[PDB]
Amino acid sequence: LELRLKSPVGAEPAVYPWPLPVYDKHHDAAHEIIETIRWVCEEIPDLKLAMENYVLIDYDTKSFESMQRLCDKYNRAIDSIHQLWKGNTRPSTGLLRHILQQVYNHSVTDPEKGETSFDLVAQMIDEIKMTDDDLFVDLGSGVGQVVLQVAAATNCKHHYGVEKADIPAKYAETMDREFRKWMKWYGKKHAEYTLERGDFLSEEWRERIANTSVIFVNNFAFGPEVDHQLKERFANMKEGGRIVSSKPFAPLNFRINSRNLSDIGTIMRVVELSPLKSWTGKPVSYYLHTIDRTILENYFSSLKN
Ligand SMILES: Cc1ncccc1-c1c(Cl)sc2ccc(NC(=O)NCC(=O)NCCCN(C)[C@@H]3CCCN(c4ncnc5c4CC=N5)C3)cc12
């Protein structure tokens, strides 16, 4: 008693047991199956032609037979297309959102222990414009969704996620497995990444932060001691190093003077960025900090002149 979806690239099939799992009040495996089929049909125009029209319209998610017939029709169309062909690119943004949701639903089995975030991360990725020279770190990466989104979208040398908390770091291990598996199932390419359990305030992480060109950090809920210690870690970063955060680490209007020479504002430019400046989501801002020690050098040059 199960349902199978054949991979469009010949990987192992996706196997779902019956009764199908319900993930939450807004997500279930039946709709995940239907949406997976629809995404594969977008990926492969021949597949849409091979598949009969009525199949994705006339379906009963509460009927094993109807869900089985839907899977059988898609599976037969995959076989016909595989036969036609007998004669790895980066996923689209829409497909990537589906993959990340699918990876999360299969990994976070008990959510008690995405949408607006996804589109915001996509905006941040578009603004920062990382290259193969960059090293990316999401400081306090949770279950790893931001790292997975960035790794699937950019060509950074490596993407890292560091998470201290036990429950998220444990779920991240499954998120990592499920992501690699689903990305292979669709035949989609992603850059290298690592989800690690650790403390970003450790001695090991002091040098790693110093050597990171792009840091993303959701610092909104951090205490003043974590924030204070992070500013100290950022003070070792290279010129041009960037920090994208949910709360600024220095004032937007920082003005260097004789009384504030110890502030992080002496060595970084800070700008408030917003998708509102065609966005229709939450009126949210993010903060881009760029390491620039010329702020401090110019102040000293002006003291001597
Ligand atoms: C996109 C977005 N959507 C909604 C709101 C905001 C945003 C947002 C911006 Cl707006 S900018 C931006 C940049 C990055 C990110 N990334 C993530 O969201 N990444 C996932 C995510 O879940 N991030 C939060 C994980 C929090 N953790 C459980 C721990 C809490 C305690 C601390 N901690 C911890 N870890 C390791 N060592 C440690 C510590 C403490 C001391 N030493 C981590 C997000 C955003």
From Swiss-Prot:
Q: Which domain of life is it from?
A: Eukaryota
On this chain, the residues bearing Phosphoserine are 274
Give the consequence of mutating residue 286 to A. Answer: Loss of activity
Please state every residue range assigned to the domain named DOT1: 12-304
| Residues the entry annotates as binding S-adenosyl-L-methionine | 114-116, 136-145, 163, 199-200
Subcellular location(s): the record lists: Nucleus
Q: Which disease is it linked to?
A: Defects in DOTL1 are associated with an autosomal dominant form of global developmental delay and intellectual disability, with or without one or more major congenital anomalies. The patient phenotypes are characterized by central nervous system (CNS) dysfunction, such as mild motor delay and significant speech and language delay, and a range of congenital anomalies, including brain structural anomalies, cardiac defects, varied urogenital features and growth restriction. Variants may cause a gain-of-function effect leading to an increase in cellular H3K79 methylation levels.
Functionally, this protein is described as follows:
Histone methyltransferase. Methylates 'Lys-79' of histone H3. Nucleosomes are preferred as substrate compared to free histones. Binds to DNA.
Other remarks on this protein: In contrast to other lysine histone methyltransferases, it does not contain a SET domain, suggesting the existence of another mechanism for methylation of lysine residues of histones.
Q: Which family does it belong to?
A: Belongs to the class I-like SAM-binding methyltransferase superfamily. DOT1 family.
SUBUNIT field:
Interacts with MLLT10.
Q: What is this protein called?
A: Histone-lysine N-methyltransferase, H3 lysine-79 specific
